[PDB]
């Protein structure tokens, strides 16, 4: 791949009924609390955590790829206090795609302060064909696809240095 | 049962600034949110702003933005408002209350509150001064008395008529802010004038934060 | 920012009546409004959440409806401990905005003001102010306009009024207007009169007295 | 077990998939169990499956 042209598919505004202004401290910004900026951490709006329901047929003209997310929390209460319910899941599926993670609320060794974990998978979505997530619970949609703008033979050099 | 403890009354000069806290107690402490309302006196209600302990992120209502700054401490499970370049205007009530979710859910419970008072004025206690009944014997009718505790700083002061004994028809009504930046209120009762030679009638004013405790007893007339 | 425009701004009922206040939004808000209380002195107190939710332990007669940018609030049966100010509230958007408050009274048939005037005491005369006292005494309902004439002058900036809560027992108001003037000006003039138009009151009735006779 | 042994060590452990489940109770009391290993690299959580076998 030669070149990409992000896309704006699921749009971080459409999520009306959970809250999608999640955040932390080890994705810091300027002292602040962020997060990833292509993707959405959607988290429960006062007390409910709805079906989150997302949806994309691919009419951008060439494959896109598309990254998302599943939460692994750390004790039960962060799970309750996130997301509502205890066991949930996270549905992804495409024409050649049906993945169905279930999350695992387990403690571990503090990464960043962090002792849990963002699990993140990725497919490509053929053009014309429609991607789909549905979730409970400890879904981290994407907002962004990225289309394959221009393709050829290219590379990844792993170098320590710099471009003259 | 989760409770919240926030922290004592403050009166501040004009252009300092006030830090109230909220200890919240009785469940673990990131399922927490902490919100500030806000309320002036006679006025309704007020969003502040508050934080969200799972995120560690504070959120204000774009009114305050560059005054507000609110922190947390898990320790304590302790946050903290800081309101700065304090006007009178921003004396209030400031309750904390315990909301839910990322987006501030329902509040509750919320805290008894935290009376912040902004005044370039001074800590001084009342003046009681006798509201004498009157030379009308309507005899067979009745007749109205009280005290009037002026001049004081800051709220709150208390009034009971015969140490608790008198408590029917008695009205004490709220205070006033007068021109000096000193409040003051008063106390009256309506009592059968057939009582006005036997009964003794004294009204008890109490102003914790000069500790002035007066008794003055209010005799009519003469003349 | 969005507008939550509570209506009526009060409201006199009847015991064991049933009031309705209305909330509206500005803006689509689904479910995600909750209701609050605010008895006399006391904090606010959640009554009802995401719109139709009533939180455990209060009682039945709180029912909460509404679902889009309506909103209604209902108290099927008026009790004695249910006058307070209402307020709502939302969440779904974000600068978290409150009603404006509806007020809950209780009616009772229209009554007149006890009205007693008091001239200043001798020992506040000792300091250089002199207050002089208006008081309307258990009155509804609270609306009423007193006026302060010092030799048949009217006044302005320097009255200063103030109303009590309604009365538990008799569903009742008070008022006390207090006029304050230098001693000077107060030994300066002899007739004080205060001057209250209510509504149990088929003329104005002014109290008064003259400085020094009785 | 932290490595304070001056190496890389394997480490080899074991989940039990009991064959019905009388055995899982008189074994481990309850239903329902996991077995959950964890490391900086790794993060495995099984769920034991109780079945008849051969
Ligand atoms: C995803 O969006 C694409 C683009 O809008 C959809 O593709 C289009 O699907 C329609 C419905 O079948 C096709 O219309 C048909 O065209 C054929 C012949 O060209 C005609 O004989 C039929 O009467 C009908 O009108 C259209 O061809 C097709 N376009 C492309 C790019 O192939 C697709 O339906 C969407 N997927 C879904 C269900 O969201």
Request: net charge negative; hydrophobic share 25%.
């Given at each position: 791949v030669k070149h990409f042209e992000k896309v704006k598919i699921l749009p971080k505004d459409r999520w009306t009924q959970h809250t999608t202004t999640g955040g932390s401290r080890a994705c810091a910004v300027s002292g602040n609390p962020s997060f990833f900026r292509n993707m959405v951490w959607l988290t429960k709006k006062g007390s409910d955590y709805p079906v989150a329901k997302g949806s994309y047929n691919n009419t951008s003209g060439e494959q896109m790829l598309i990254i998302w997310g599943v939460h692994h929390p750390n004790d039960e209460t962060e799970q309750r206090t996130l997301y509502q319910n205890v066991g949930t899941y996270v549905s992804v599926g495409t024409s050649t795609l049906n993945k169905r993670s279930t999350p695992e609320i387990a403690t571990r060794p503090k990464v960043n302060g962090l002792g849990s974990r963002m699990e993140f998978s990725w497919t490509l979505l053929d053009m014309w064909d429609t991607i789909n997530f549905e979730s409970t619970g400890n879904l981290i949609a994407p907002e962004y696809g990225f289309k394959i703008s221009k393709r050829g033979s290219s590379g990844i050099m792993k170098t320590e240095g710099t471009l003259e | 049962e989760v409770q919240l403890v926030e922290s004592g009354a403050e009166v501040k000069k004009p252009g300092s600034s006030v830090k109230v806290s909220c200890k919240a107690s009785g469940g673990t402490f990131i399922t927490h949110v902490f919100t500030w309302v806000r309320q002036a006196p006679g006025q309704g209600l007020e969003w502040v702003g508050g934080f969200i302990a799972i995120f560690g992120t504070s959120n204000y209502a774009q009114k305050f933005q560059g005054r507000v700054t609110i922190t947390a401490d898990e320790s304590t499970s302790t946050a903290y408002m800081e309101l700065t370049?304090?006007?009178?205007?921003?004396?209030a009530v400031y309750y904390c209350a315990r909301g839910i979710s990322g987006s501030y859910?329902?509040?509750?419970?919320?805290?008894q509150g935290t009376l912040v008072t902004v005044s370039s004025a001074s800590t001084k206690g009342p003046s009681v001064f006798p509201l004498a009944p009157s030379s009308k014997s309507t005899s067979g009718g009745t007749a109205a008395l009280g005290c009037l505790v002026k001049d004081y700083f800051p709220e709150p002061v208390t009034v009971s008529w015969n140490s608790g004994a008198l408590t029917s028809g008695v009205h004490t009504f709220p205070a006033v802010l007068q021109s000096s930046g000193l409040y003051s209120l008063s106390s009256v009762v309506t009592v059968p004038s057939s009582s006005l030679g036997t009964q003794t009638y004294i009204c008890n004013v109490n102003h914790k934060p000069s500790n002035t405790k007066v008794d003055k007893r209010v005799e009519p007339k003469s003349c | 920012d969005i507008q939550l425009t509570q209506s009526p701004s009060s409201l006199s009922a009847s015991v064991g009546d049933r009031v309705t206040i209305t909330c509206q939004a500005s803006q689509d808000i689904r479910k995600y409004l909750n209701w609050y209380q605010q008895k006399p002195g006391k904090a606010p107190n959640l009554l009802i959440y995401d719109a139709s939710n009533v939180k455990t332990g209060v009682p039945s007669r709180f029912r909460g409806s509404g679902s889009g940018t309506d909103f209604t609030f209902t108290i099927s049966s008026l009790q004695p401990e249910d006058i307070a100010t209402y307020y709502c509230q939302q969440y779904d958007n974000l600068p978290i905005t409150f009603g404006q408050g509806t007020r809950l009274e209780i009616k009772r048939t229209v009554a007149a003001p006890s009205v007693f005037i008091f001239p200043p005491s001798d020992e506040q005369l000792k300091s250089g102010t002199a207050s002089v006292v208006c008081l309307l005494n258990n009155?509804?309902?609270?609306?009423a306009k007193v006026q302060w004439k010092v030799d048949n002058a009217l006044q302005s900036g320097n009255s200063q009024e103030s109303v009590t809560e309604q009365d538990s027992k008799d569903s009742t108001y008070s008022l006390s207007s207090t006029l304050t003037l230098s001693k000077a000006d107060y030994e300066k003039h002899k007739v004080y009169a205060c001057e209250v138009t209510h509504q149990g009151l088929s003329s104005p009735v002014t109290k008064s007295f003259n400085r020094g006779e009785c």
């Open positions: - | 370049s304090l006007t009178s205007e921003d004396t859910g329902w509040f509750d419970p919320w805290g | 009155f509804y309902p609270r609306e």
